[PDB]
């Protein structure tokens, strides 16, 4: 006997309503098996992978991850895949959870401007990745072609206050992290499993700041967590909290009371969180350079009353979250645009640099540039800075050590090099500093920094 | 009290019968503990890791993975390791599941032409990796020195229709993927965990096409799945199906109803599959560039009646499986041999290119070269191709974009670069195309391609 | 209702006594919730990451991993973080298991010479990683800022004979593995997840030889195992044994009877071992090049009577453990020091080379240099060696193959290149060989080897 043996479809055919991340369709709330018609369209389009960084994504439904599909175990799914006429590549789909060769792949092969369909019975309850299955498969997945399908148990999942949709991916650009412009896919980096970005929901900042997920103290939150890969395994973790439950795919096993859980490439899990004290809870890949150097952080922000008996401390700030503590970094997008257009102003640079200074520089120099007398020198009204802005470019790129005098006080410490910052980033940060705190004004250009990078002091 | 406390060996000594992958010895079918004599011989020998690509493997029993060993919990195992006289290196063994230092390693040290033996009690039921334990251990394991030992529970495992033996490994060649010739081991790639091949059972195609595993609709299949490493963790997955059960080593935990499962380096699992609808089910490492760019795919092919109520779609084809959809790629081996011998004919190239065109080119241009008018230009009777075969070499290596006219129709799309193809591969593919579909004939040589690669248009 | 709801703190405030690795504080042995005051001080200091290789570690409590903290579920923890005045960087803490944003991070931000404190309730039983949470977070963690906190269940853990503390980390030096001197942190290697060292407890050899963990036949051993990362996932394994139990963090799930288990980056587990036969049991990351090429091996040495019915074989030796079979490699530290001071003697080199010869060379040439006539040529009284010591440098770096005659006998085999050995290592090994076994004496210098490396034969 096959699983999901609930009899023939009954009632009326249902046209599935799909949702865009980070939202989820409502519970199916149904006691009978149905014929469910799913319509999904592939769209190839440029989007911002980071501020001022464009990428040609290939998408199911216009988003990365693709639209969320929700059905019931025992349903008959008539799956329609359309490929938008603007596409250049053919596409198809493999849904995990499908019983049949390729998960649908042969029957869903769809050239630009065409449509395909196939039918399958959802035998398997669980949360499942779906993805493109078109040669070269890794290129298609790396370009964003993945999402989740939930096959509910017949009785439905337990009710919760919120349901969200979060999916990790690894991305491979020709340029380095935060290098501006339209970035091609990089096959060599992909084969070597050396991503430039590791993201939730298709972009840096997709789920941080003003795009955070929300709930209130006392509420329950279910997150459907995918790992589209193509290549990485996520050490998936919530900072400052615990998962009540973690369940992989449709497995019988449920782990309870864990904070860190490994999600295979192509894997998916359902996690549950109970909000206990207010603040921001960070979802990360705890392979830490991914989370803190490549974009792999998302936020669940909890509103409500503090409970000092449980936690006396403060909300997260830029020391830990860096430049993602703030609502957004729109000023960086604006400055990059203005550079392209040849209209970059001092103030455009100042505002971009203000955004980028947070964490990156403020951890030591403070948000007001005051530093800490004798320990971290000031950037505010800094004689040392004013005396030689080219030296300041060298200091950011190449670090500084040894005894120095700043505003009448000796320092004898170490500023690490920050060579991973791009030329525009150094330029904008220093222009911000120069135009703040009674510093002398003026500006530093990306070309100025390019020259210092090519010939260090 | 020790585990496996079933009393002294009884009956007669048993000479274990070992099997070569992908086959498994029969169930032990025994209710008493025995003395089991195991004889395993190390052989160093060249084998084909891919078509036309030789590698010096170091093997237990002549195969990668090594011979499968099957005993019963509570048995006393007298383990004999022989090192063939032709070997250049000493070798030994560490069997996971052994209770004792090194898993046998010190007592099994065996120089070329020698034999060693040691005895251990199998206290631990489970599936276990064994491997060489000779400095430099990583070199020995990377060269193929790993296999599985099953220690059955006293009552035996439940009966199934088929049992198979599949083992992943990561391999490190000096040359790139599919670069022909005898490829040395590459220590630098190994230390960096940057394999050139990721394989099941020691070779590309070892379990695809005419070497697939088989079963019928309704049957149960147990697979003993190892990960020899040395370095990679497998996001082990079955495309288009689900695992009824996954059990690691001898663990108490059994996960049920999962599709994707993480197998540690040096780990092993027993998975169970129930065949429900016919077609090819792909075992992969779902770190996708391994599966689709490095060889990490194996096939379980199911025969029987379609069930349209469960899955209406078609069997897998080259869109998803690429050049492994076909029974084999023997023509590539033959062409490579002929190149070495200086006897390479046009037809040798044509047949090799025919094999390599599948998926790689046919996904867009179709198996008949017709393309799709206005969307993917034809290779069949292509004026554009005929007009400039050196341009065609550049197009394969370096891609093509922009408006073009082919056979009277405008195209305005993007063909990605395919620079990872080796010179012989480009040459053979283009020679196939030129000699098909009313194209003008002639040939492209590997040297022709080498020159275009050294100086792009 | 919140977990750990055991009522208000009672009794007297408790000043936690913290332990340095590999030791653990005693069981709390308490039936009431308490206020527990924890005092931890950050110290930045140079330590030896390997013999003759210094590194500037950043530490919680002077060690890597940091001091072990042990409390009871339901306790109120008043956490004090001090930053030693000698520090150059600010620091803070995120304790997994804390319920609150950042796990403590915002409220624990501490400049050099300062102190911070915050209070949290330990709601969550389990073993948990703690680490620094200061931008750039990956740099801080890579420099050693991680440890474990145990939150006991209210009834305590079951009693065992020994409890130990073992924590894996990945490290990123500018220089290659075993390159001597003070090694800077390497940001590029860190971002790429390409460590030069993978270690237990902060150094090569930290838990090998005379620093092994101990127990006796029949005893139980609990190990609190952390993975500080920052980036790697451990295929954590015990050679020659099995784990009775593995439990992650505070999870409900407990796996029993497994040998190989995946520990996420930032993860922690409690494992249990029962000693059955004497010898050395190796804890490794079974991504094997880590264990055998980067330092990721630790030893649990069991004393007591052999049981030939369970295991007839011998204790581990240098064939498997390599140069870590011996008690220590102090001679390498001494020789490196003497080179720095310009006082390096022949005997300093000889003793360093003796240490390094084990495994590395002895696997084939034997500990006495005799080789195996006709199979592995002798280094003892070797005419071939004496005839040309520059050829001998080339042989170590670049390998040797083909027919040769040594001491009147023909060999026709392959010695692999050993190019990963550093110049001082080759020099010291060859000086050892030259000064042993009736060889002619003299010495080989690091500069001699540098020249052969720059121009191979
Ligand atoms: C702590 C880890 C720091 C971070 C992050 C940044 N800086 Fe820094 N900076 C730091 C120290 C300890 C020092 C002095 C080094 C010494 O030799 O004692 C400095 C110095 C500077 C200076 C020059 C002195 C001055 O004008 O105060 C400049 C211009 C400067 N730092 C700039 C700067 C910027 C823009 C940063 C973000 C990109 C940044 N620093 C980070 C410590 C740390
Ligand atoms: C889809 C992703 C493709 C794959 C895979 C391959 N080709 Fe292609 N090719 C494709 C397009 C869209 C185009 C036109 C580009 C444009 O500027 O509009 C092409 C073009 C060619 C040509 C030249 C035109 C012609 O003769 O039709 C050649 C010779 C060609 N392609 C060859 C070729 C081969 C041999 C491939 C496998 C190695 C291959 N292509 C793959 C799209 C795609
Ligand atoms: C086995 C895998 C070996 C290891 C490890 C090392 N050596 Fe070796 N060595 C080996 C062989 C098979 C040969 C002969 C190669 C052939 O062409 O047949 C050699 C040779 C040497 C020699 C020259 C001959 C002699 O004097 O005996 C030297 C000087 C030598 N080997 C040194 C040496 C050292 C110092 C090693 C550790 C760094 C080492 N070898 C490792 C096999 C193996
Ligand atoms: Cu696609
Ligand atoms: Cu998949
Ligand atoms: Cu071997
Ligand atoms: Cu092993
Ligand atoms: Cu720190
Ligand atoms: Cu953490």
Residues, chain C: 457
Dihedral of CA atoms A249, A263, C236, A281 in degrees, nearest 10, equals -120
d(CA C303, CA C330): 25
Q: Residue C391 is encoded by which pair of tokens?
A: 């050829």
- A neighbours by CB contacts (3+ pairs under 8 Å): B, C
d(CA A144, CA A153): 28
d(CA B423, CA B446): 5
- Based on its alpha-carbon atoms, the radius of gyration of chain C, rounded to whole angstroms, reads 25
Residues 6+ apart with CB under 8 A from A454: none
3-class DSSP string for chain C:
CCCCCCCCCCCCCEECCCECCCCCCCCCCCCCCCEEEEEEEEEEEEEEEECCEEEEEEEECCCCCCCEEEEECCCEEEEEEEECCCCCCCECCEECCCCCHHHHCHHHCECCCCEEEEEEECCCCEEEEEECCCCCHHHHHHCCCEEEEEEECCCCCCCCCEEEEEEEEEECECCCCCCCEEECECHHHHHCCCCCEEEECCCCCCCCHHHCEEEECCCEEEEEEEEEECCCCEEEEEECCCEEEEEECCCCCCEEEECEEEECCCCEEEEEEECCCCEEEEEEECCHHHHHHCCCEEEEEEECCCCCCCECCCCCCHHHHHHHCCCCCHHHHHHHHHHHHCCCCHHHHHHHHHHHHCCCCHHHHCCCCCCECCCECCCCCCHHHHHCHHHHHHHHHHCEEEEEEECCEEEEEEECCCCCCCHHHHHHHHHHHHCCCCCCCCCCCHHHHHHHHHCCC
Residue at token pair 């191979």: C456
First vs last C-alpha separation in chain B: 75
d(CA B115, CA A323): 64
Residues A289-327: b if buried by 16+ CB within 10 A, e if exposed: bbbbbbbbbbbbbbeeebbeebbbbbbbbbbbbbbbbbe
d(CA A160, CA A220): 5
d(CA B224, CA B273): 12
d(CA B208, CA B199): 11
Dihedral sign for Cα atoms in the order A127, A132, A134, A137: negative
Task: Name the phi and psi angles at C346, rounded to 5.
Answer: -55, -50
Resolution of this structure in Å? 1.0
Residues 6+ apart with CB under 8 A from C226: C65, C127, C129, C146, C147, C148, C166, C167, C168, C263, C267, C268
d(CA A450, CA A433): 19
Residue whose Cα lies nearest atom 19 of ligand 2: it is B415
Number of other residues whose CB lies within 10 A of the CB of residue B175: 15
Cα A362 to the chain's mean position, in Å? 23
CA of B131 to the centre of ligand 7 (A): 6
Query: Using a 6 Å cutoff on CB, does residue A385 contact ligand 1?
Result: yes
Rounded-to-5 percentages of helix, strand, coil across chain A: 20, 35, 45
Task: Name the phi and psi angles at C454, rounded to 5.
Answer: -70, -20
Query: Using a 6 Å cutoff on CB, does residue A415 contact ligand 1?
Result: yes
Cis peptide before B22 (omega within 30 of 0): yes
d(CA C141, CA B61): 45
Residue whose Cα lies nearest atom 29 of ligand 2: it is B392
Q: Residue B195 is encoded by which pair of tokens?
A: 């394999």
Chain C CB contacts of A372 under 8 Å are 111
Number of other residues whose CB lies within 10 A of the CB of residue C438: 10
- For A138, the enclosing helix (H) or strand (E) is helix A137-142
Running DSSP on this structure, what letter comes out for residue A75? -
Running DSSP on this structure, what letter comes out for residue B162? E
Q: Is C147 exposed, middle or buried (0-12, 13-18, 19+ CB in 10 A)?
A: buried
d(CA B54, CA A64): 42
Residues 6+ apart with CB under 8 A from A123: A2, A3, A4, A73, A74, A99, B276, B310
Q: Is B299 exposed, middle or buried (0-12, 13-18, 19+ CB in 10 A)?
A: buried
Q: Residue A96 is encoded by which pair of tokens?
A: 């995990």
Query: Ligand 1, closest atom to CA A377?
Result: 27
First vs last C-alpha separation in chain A: 75
Residues 6+ apart with CB under 8 A from B445: B427
Please say whether the beta carbons of B128 and B135 come within 8 A.
Answer: no
Q: Which of A62, B133, B449, A293 is nearest to C321 (CA)?
A: B133
Task: Classify B59 as helix, strand or coil.
Answer: strand
Q: Which of A27, A33, A24 is nearest to A4 (CA)?
A: A33
* Closest Cβ–Cβ partner in B97, B118, B252 for C312: B118
Q: Residue B7 is encoded by which pair of tokens?
A: 């009393």
Query: Using a 6 Å cutoff on CB, does residue A406 contact ligand 1?
Result: yes
Cβ–Cβ below 8 Å for A417 and C136: no
* Closest Cβ–Cβ partner in B90, B106, B233 for C364: B90
Q: Please tell me the number of Cα atoms within 13 Å of B154 on its side-chain side.
A: 10
Q: Tell me whether A316 touches chain C (CB under 8 Å).
A: yes
Return the best residue to mutate from A178, A354, A359, A365 for the ligand 1 pocket (most ligand atoms within 8 A of CB): A365
Number of other residues whose CB lies within 10 A of the CB of residue B32: 14
The CA-atom distances, in angstroms, between C322 and each of C148, C150, C292 are 30, 34, 8
Q: How many residue contacts between B and C have a Cβ separation below 8 Å?
A: 192
Query: Using a 6 Å cutoff on CB, does residue B397 contact ligand 2?
Result: no
Cβ–Cβ below 8 Å for B135 and C375: no
Q: Which of C324, C328, C337, C321 is nearest to C424 (CA)?
A: C337
- C neighbours by CB contacts (3+ pairs under 8 Å): A, B
- For A141, the enclosing helix (H) or strand (E) is helix A137-142
Task: Name the phi and psi angles at B40, rounded to 5.
Answer: -135, 135
Q: Tell me whether C234 touches chain A (CB under 8 Å).
A: no
The CA-atom distances, in angstroms, between A248 and each of A12, A252, A332, B246, B274 are 32, 9, 38, 13, 20
Q: Residue C319 is encoded by which pair of tokens?
A: 């064939």
Residue at token pair 């040939």: B443
Please say whether the beta carbons of C231 and A287 come within 8 A.
Answer: yes
d(CA C117, CA C107): 7
d(CA C227, CA C244): 20
Q: Tell me whether A38 touches chain B (CB under 8 Å).
A: no
Task: Name the phi and psi angles at B354, rounded to 5.
Answer: -60, -45
d(CA A439, CA B357): 64
Q: Which of A277, A287, A238, A306 is nearest to C97 (CA)?
A: A238
Task: Classify B322 as helix, strand or coil.
Answer: helix
Cα A326 to the chain's mean position, in Å? 16
d(CA B55, CA C271): 40
Helix axes A423-434, A330-341, angle to 10 degrees: 110
Task: Name the phi and psi angles at B372, rounded to 5.
Answer: -145, 110
Residues with CB under 5 A from ligand 4 (ion): A 91, 132, 134, 140, 145
Helix axes C423-434, C346-357, angle to 10 degrees: 100
Cβ–Cβ below 8 Å for C99 and A414: no
Number of other residues whose CB lies within 10 A of the CB of residue A410: 10
Q: Is B47 exposed, middle or buried (0-12, 13-18, 19+ CB in 10 A)?
A: middle
Please say whether the beta carbons of A348 and A443 come within 8 A.
Answer: no
Please say whether the beta carbons of A228 and A129 come within 8 A.
Answer: yes
Strand ranges inside A19-161, DSSP E? 35-50, 53-60, 69-72, 76-83, 94-95, 115-121, 126-131, 146-152
d(CA B49, CA B56): 9
Number of other residues whose CB lies within 10 A of the CB of residue B445: 18
Chain A CB contacts of B315 under 8 Å are 101, 106
CA of A228 to the centre of ligand 4 (A): 13
d(CA C65, CA B77): 41
Residue at token pair 């379980």: B300
Number of other residues whose CB lies within 10 A of the CB of residue C442: 12
∠ CA(C21), CA(C23), CA(C24), 5° rounding? 115
CA of A260 to the centre of ligand 9 (A): 9
Strand ranges inside B61-196, DSSP E? 69-72, 76-83, 94-95, 115-121, 126-131, 146-152, 162-171, 181-183
d(CA A211, CA A327): 8
Running DSSP on this structure, what letter comes out for residue A146? E
Query: Ligand 1, closest atom to CA C89?
Result: 2
Q: Is C347 exposed, middle or buried (0-12, 13-18, 19+ CB in 10 A)?
A: middle
Q: What is the layout of strands, in order, in the sheet containing B260-263?
A: B213-216, B297-303, B279-285, B234-239, B260-263
> Which residues of chain A from 404 to 443 reach within 8 Å of chain B, CB to CB?
none
Running DSSP on this structure, what letter comes out for residue A103? G
Task: Sort strands A181-183 and A234-239 into parallel, antiparallel or unpaired.
Answer: unpaired
d(CA C128, CA C217): 30
d(CA A19, CA A25): 6
d(CA C160, CA C272): 9
Query: Using a 6 Å cutoff on CB, does residue B426 contact ligand 2?
Result: no
Please say whether the beta carbons of A359 and C137 come within 8 A.
Answer: no
Cβ–Cβ below 8 Å for C264 and A261: yes
d(CA C234, CA B229): 13
d(CA B10, CA B4): 14
Strand ranges inside B114-249, DSSP E? 115-121, 126-131, 146-152, 162-171, 181-183, 197-200, 213-216, 220-229, 234-239, 243-248
> Which residues of chain B from 353 to 382 reach within 8 Å of chain C, CB to CB?
none
Q: Which of C152, C199, C163 is nearest to C57 (CA)?
A: C199
d(CA C294, CA C289): 7
Question: What residue ranges define each of the domains in chain C, with the CATH number in brackets?
Answer: 1-156 (2.60.40.420), 157-329 (2.60.40.420), 330-457 (1.10.760.10)
d(CA C388, CA C371): 19
Q: Residue A406 forms beta bridges with which residues?
A: A409
Task: Classify B174 as helix, strand or coil.
Answer: coil
∠ CA(A349), CA(A352), CA(A353), 5° rounding? 80
Number of other residues whose CB lies within 10 A of the CB of residue A36: 22
∠ CA(B445), CA(B448), CA(B452), 5° rounding? 145
Q: Which of C26, C36, C41 is nearest to C86 (CA)?
A: C41
């Amino acid at each position: 006997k096959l699983p999901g043996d609930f009899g023939p479809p009954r009632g009326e055919p249902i046209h599935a309503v799909l949702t865009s991340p980070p939202l989820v369709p409502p519970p199916v709330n149904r006691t009978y098996p149905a014929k469910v018609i799913v319509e999904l369209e592939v769209v190839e389009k440029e989007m911002q992978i980071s501020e001022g960084v464009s990428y040609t994504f290939w998408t199911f439904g216009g988003t990365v991850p693709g639209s969320f599909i929700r059905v019931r175990q025992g349903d008959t799914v008539e799956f329609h895949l359309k490929n938008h006429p603007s596409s250049k590549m053919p596409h198809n789909i493999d849904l995990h959870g499908v019983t049949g060769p390729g998960g649908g792949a042969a029957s869903s092969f769809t050239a630009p401007g065409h449509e395909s369909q196939f039918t399958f019975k959802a035998l398997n309850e669980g949360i499942y990745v779906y993805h493109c299955a078109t040669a070269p498969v890794g290129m298609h997945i790396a370009n964003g072609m993945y999402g989740l399908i939930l096959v509910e148990p017949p009785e439905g999942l337990p009710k919760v206050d919120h349901e969200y949709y979060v999916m990790q991916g690894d991305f491979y650009t020709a340029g380095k992290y935060r290098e501006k412009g339209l970035q091609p896919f990089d096959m060599e980096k992909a084969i070597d499993e050396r991503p430039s970005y590791v993201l939730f929901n298709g972009a840096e900042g997709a789920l941080t700041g003003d795009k955070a997920l929300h709930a209130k103290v006392g509420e329950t939150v279910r997150i459907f967590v995918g790992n589209g890969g193509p290549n990485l395994v996520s050490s998936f973790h919530v900072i400052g909290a615990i998962f009540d439950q973690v369940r992989y795919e449709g497995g019988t096993n449920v782990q309870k009371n864990v904070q860190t859980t490994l999600i295979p490439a192509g894997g998916a899990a359902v996690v549950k969180f109970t909000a206990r004290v207010p603040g921001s809870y960070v979802l990360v890949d705890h392979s830490i350079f991914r989370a803190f150097n490549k974009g792999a952080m998302a936020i669940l922000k909890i509103d409500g009353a503090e409970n000092k008996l449980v936690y006396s401390g403060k909300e997260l700030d830029s020391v830990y979250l860096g430049d993602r503590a703030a609502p957004n970094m729109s000023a960086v997008t604006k400055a990059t645009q203005a550079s392209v257009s040849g209209t970059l102003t001092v103030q455009d640079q100042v505002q971009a640099g203000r955004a980028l200074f947070a964490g990156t520089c403020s951890v030591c120099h403070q948000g007001n540039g005051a530093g800490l007398p004798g320990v971290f020198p000031p950037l505010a009204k800094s004689d040392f800075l004013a005396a030689d802005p080219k030296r300041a470019m060298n200091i950011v790129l190449h670090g500084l050590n040894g005894k120095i005098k700043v505003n009448g006080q000796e320092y004898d410490s170490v500023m690490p090099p920050m060579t991973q910052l791009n030329d525009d980033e150094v330029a904008n940060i220093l222009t911000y500093v120069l135009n703040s705190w009674d510093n002398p004004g003026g500006r530093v250009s990306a070309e100025d920094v390019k020259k210092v990078r090519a010939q260090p002091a």
